[PDB]
Amino acid sequence: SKPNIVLIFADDAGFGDFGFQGSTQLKTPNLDKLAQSGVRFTQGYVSDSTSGPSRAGLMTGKYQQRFGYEEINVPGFMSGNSALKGADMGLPLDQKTMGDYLKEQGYKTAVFGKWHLGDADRFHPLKRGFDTFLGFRGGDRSYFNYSEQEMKNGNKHFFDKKLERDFGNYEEPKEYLTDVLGKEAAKYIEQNKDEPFFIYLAFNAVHTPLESDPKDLAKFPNLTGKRKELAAMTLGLDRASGYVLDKLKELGLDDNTIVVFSNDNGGPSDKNASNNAPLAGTKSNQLEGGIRVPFLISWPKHIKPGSTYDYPVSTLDLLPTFYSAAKGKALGSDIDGVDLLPYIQGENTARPHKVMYWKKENRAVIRDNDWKLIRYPDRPAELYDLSSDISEQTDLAAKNPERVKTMFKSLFEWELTLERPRWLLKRKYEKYDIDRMDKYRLPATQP
Amino acid sequence: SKPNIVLIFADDAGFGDFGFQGSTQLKTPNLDKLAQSGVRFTQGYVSDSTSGPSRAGLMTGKYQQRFGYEEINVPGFMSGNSALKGADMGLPLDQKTMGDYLKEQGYKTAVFGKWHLGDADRFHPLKRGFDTFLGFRGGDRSYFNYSEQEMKNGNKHFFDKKLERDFGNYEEPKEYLTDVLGKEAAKYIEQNKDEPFFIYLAFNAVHTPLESDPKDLAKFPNLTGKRKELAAMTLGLDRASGYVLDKLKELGLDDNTIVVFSNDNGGPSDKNASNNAPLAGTKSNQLEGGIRVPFLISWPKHIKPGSTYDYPVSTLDLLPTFYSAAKGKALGSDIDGVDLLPYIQGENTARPHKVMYWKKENRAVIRDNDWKLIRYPDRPAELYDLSSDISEQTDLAAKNPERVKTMFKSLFEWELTLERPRWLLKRKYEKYDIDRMDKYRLPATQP
Ligand SMILES: O=S(=O)(O)O[C@@H]1[C@H](O[C@H]2O[C@@H]3CO[C@@H]([C@H]3O)[C@H]2O)[C@@H](O)[C@H](O)O[C@@H]1CO
Ligand SMILES: O=S(=O)(O)O[C@@H]1[C@H](O[C@H]2O[C@@H]3CO[C@@H]([C@H]3O)[C@H]2O)[C@@H](O)[C@H](O)O[C@@H]1CO
Ligand SMILES: [Ca+2]
Ligand SMILES: [Ca+2]
Ligand SMILES: [Cl-]
Ligand SMILES: [Cl-]
Ligand SMILES: [Zn+2]
Ligand SMILES: [Zn+2]
């Protein structure tokens, strides 16, 4: 029978900020049990170090730069010269989503929480292969209800923060947003328990603003300031994930449900006190700390519990993995991801991806097996062996000049397959991205 | 007394394709006499290796990337994702031109020939500080008249090729276009001989298409194919320049006229058989062959004949040089060029520009004294000492790693002062630009 699919996708979480990732300071008991129920990927990657492009890759199974979704869509952050601004920045309409492909296979489809794939009506999830929505079009919002005064005083971009049911039915959350999203996902499972369903549960946790349930804050008496708020927000994320995992268990659906847990980008250590241990870097740089994310898959009928998979995988792999599981036999020729199940099961012992790519303007990465070439606008290209240097502290470029040259040529060959970007950030954000990378250049460690 | 100013600006000429630049094969007797009458710059630079951005720099005295004019405006070559296309690509209206500054000093101002600073009415020379125009809005056109059928049946961009008098009075050339432009400039001098005037004579010679006066072709029986056409087109450019220089001499105006001769970008050796000897590279790359140009200034009242100046200078310097000569005392604080006259006269013995910059997307150059750092998307950054290696054959990056790092940081610091581009080329043109660079990577020789 066609399995249910639940994709749980956090925002701005630290690589080290889960029990199953080695945290003793933060508590994620429900997600730790999910990790134990299935396979944990030690080298799971997003397709970009920021939210919008990462989600564009996830939703399409494609390198998002191929359709010009290169720089992040943040209304108010965009160049005065940007081709598209405000509500016009969105996943191009000619792209086929995860939702569209699973609808073709007879699935009920729903998205809860953060969309961030366009604010205009034409970009709405209910036009992009989702039957049901409760969430917000934009990129960040309060974990509590906005007052009438806050909504009346919002700038022209503020409307994308409003919580929305299906197509334009605006309704603020009645309790802590993380709990609302988890309970709504659980209600959807209950309502659709007799048919195949796909849920995209896109928490805004643990993105700013740093707002928590006071009862969650009170569980971390020894933490202070931003770190205390992150701990409480992480406990909330884990509890709300628990509502969904517990509903699957209670209804006897979890055996034939694919549950994925991942994260849209590396932790912004300066904004939400996220910790990417043992990685260097953060959100919005292409060090491991920005692009490597917590990544779990559970499917009890096909995946051994307590297992780990150690070759690189991508969120780009999730569309073809889901589509294959849904018995799909008409996958677009343009898909960059691969079906992971044969790799997870050990039927295919090769690497899912020999070569992987990242790009924002002049900043780009080509990875070939465990060699990682990083290109920058402001310093010579660096070469890392990730098999011996997870924290990217030992530059090998000078000692491997032929490999640097061949990897440079391969990177540019891939860049020639991309469209020009559809929108551009203000110039100042490139200084911020590089300065934050240099601030977090040393390996992070568990506290 | 305020001097007359005549700026003669060729298109796509080879660095070596003039008598005064060391050609024995090509004939430029009028421009050779101009060189002998004044100062020849051995290190004269444009602000970009392509027409539009080069002209935007020339016309403003500013790094054109500071107002987003980074990639060339060619209607039909632009990305489907480009912010501006067709007639909307043009010199931003908030920029003050050479024309505007000289109009403030009580000059009559005229442009003849190629404009290429925007096709829409609002970008027209008569809105940008020019009283008089005979030329074409766009980037290239036939040296002979278009028929009514050719003009009626052109694609939607073709109208920018039509020869135009002042504001929208269309009239095709009655003779070889190079002769028309030179004679019209000479008539303007005659009509305005009793008052200060500024003429911008922007020849389309020696840009494609390769069309010549048959009488000029017949002077080069020993040359064949594209090189024979270039020789004839170059003879025409030199003759038409002669009409202007001879009119100044005949009316007794040349003593107190500043005559400048330069070129919009390096020779496209693969298109018009231009030869950039002794330089490596071409049009649309940032090797010396793309950015270094023939550069002459004559002003008999102030500049010694037969002189050479060997420190780097820029077309960016021409606006402040002209404005100072016109007795201007209110130069904008935003000007990147300097007044060259004190440097030419030896009053200021320093370099006009210690640090110079070039940029198109990932391709950029920072020059510091005679050190040149070249950044590429597809190979490690290279370092040249131009004082010992004019042809950029000996990469010194490996032996000077501290200087590579410091120059990289300085380059990026300048990039942070720029706007994002206002329009973007189709991706395929970056492959063309890099492949042509590699084809002409060796030094050119006379041939
Ligand atoms: O998680 S998001 O990427 O969506 O967060 C963004 C924003 O973060 C960005 O800010 C600029 C643009 O790209 C880089 C940085 O240079 C990225 O970190 C975040 O600061 C803001 O609070 O929310 C938006 C989403 O709305
Ligand atoms: O001299 S021009 O640059 O104005 O000539 C251009 C064009 O040359 C360009 O073509 C693409 C875009 O940038 C590079 C190259 O990658 C530059 O060489 C030339 O081929 C064409 O014939 O005329 C246009 C101007 O209309
Ligand atoms: Ca995020
Ligand atoms: Ca040109
Ligand atoms: Cl951030
Ligand atoms: Cl060309
Ligand atoms: Zn005279
Ligand atoms: Zn004289």
Element (H, E) at A430: helix A428-439
Cα B255 to middle of ligand 8, angstroms = 5
Alpha carbons B119 and B138: distance in angstroms, whole number: 6
**Cβ contacts from A onto B, under 8 A:** 94
DSSP A101-149: HHHHTT-EEEEEEE--SBSSGGGSGGGTT-SEEEEESSS---SSPPPHH
Rg (CA), chain A: 20
Residue by residue, DSSP assigns A243-280 as HHHHHHHHTT-GGGEEEEEEESS---HHHH----TT--
Residue A128 touches partner B, C-beta closer than 8 Å: no
Range list of β-strands (E), A252-353:
257-263, 296-298, 307-309, 313-314
- Residues sharing a CB contact under 8 Å with residue B169, sequence separation 6 or more, in sequence order: none
Collapsing DSSP states into helix, strand and coil, what is residue A185? helix
Residues whose CB is less than 8 angstroms from the CB of residue B49 and which lie 6 or more positions away in sequence, other chains included: B265, B266, B283, B284, B285, B286, B290, B291, B358, B360
Q: Is the CB of A284 under 6 A from ligand 1?
A: yes
B80 in contact with A, Cβ within 8 Å: yes
C-alpha distances out from residue B278 to A416, A426, B23, B282, Å:
31, 41, 11, 12
Q: How far apart are CA A18 and CA B32, in angstroms?
A: 76
CB contact under 8 A, A416 and B430: yes
Rounded Cα distance, B406 and A153, in Å: 47
Helix or strand holding residue B446 (H, E): none
Spatial separation of the C-alpha atoms in residues B57 and B63, rounded to whole Å? 6
Q: Which residue among B51, B204, B361 is best mutated to probe the pocket of ligand 2, counting the most ligand atoms within 8 A of its Cβ? A: B51
Method: X-ray
Strands B307-309 and B39-41 come out as parallel
Q: What is the CA radius of gyration of chain B?
A: 21
Task: Render B1-48 in DSSP notation, one character per residue.
Answer: -PPEEEEEEESS--TT-SGGGT-SSS--HHHHHHHHHSEEETTEE-SS
In whole angstroms, give the CA distance from residue B364 to residue B223.
Answer: 37
* Buried-state track A60-95, b at ≥16 Cβ within 10 A, e below 16: bbbbbbbbbbbbbbbbebbbebbbbbbbbbbbbeeb
Longest dimension (CA), chain A: 62
Contact A444, A92 (CB under 8 A): no
Q: Which residues in chain B have Cβ-Cβ distances shorter than 8 Å to A83?
A: 81-83
Resolution (A): 2.0
Per DSSP, helices labelled H in B62-221 are 98-104, 148-152, 177-191, 214-217
Q: Which two tokens stand for residue B436?
A: 């042509």
Residue B234 near residue B28 (C-beta atoms within 8 A): yes
**φ and ψ at A209, to 5 degrees?**
-75, 155
Nearest to B115 by CA among B200, B5, B241: B200
Measured in degrees and rounded to the nearest 5, phi and psi for residue B364 equal -150, 160
* B167 C-beta neighbours (distance < 10 Å), count: 11
Using the beta-carbon criterion (under 8 Å), do A426 and B420 form an inter-chain contact? Answer: yes
The pair of structure tokens assigned to B411 is 């380059």
CA B5, CA B8: separation in Å to the nearest integer?
10
Interface test with B, best of A67, A85, A359, A378 (most B CBs within 10 A): A378
DSSP per-residue codes, A36-80: HHSEEETTEE-SSSSHHHHHHHHHHTS-GGGGT--S---TTSB-T
- Phi then psi for residue A285, to 5 deg, are -125, 165
Question: Within an 8 Å CB–CB cutoff, is residue A421 touching chain B?
Answer: yes
Q: In angstroms, rounded to a whole number, what is the distance separating the alpha carbons of residues B318 and B198?
A: 12
Please report the beta strands in A185-233, taking only residues with DSSP state E, as ranges in sequence order: 197-202
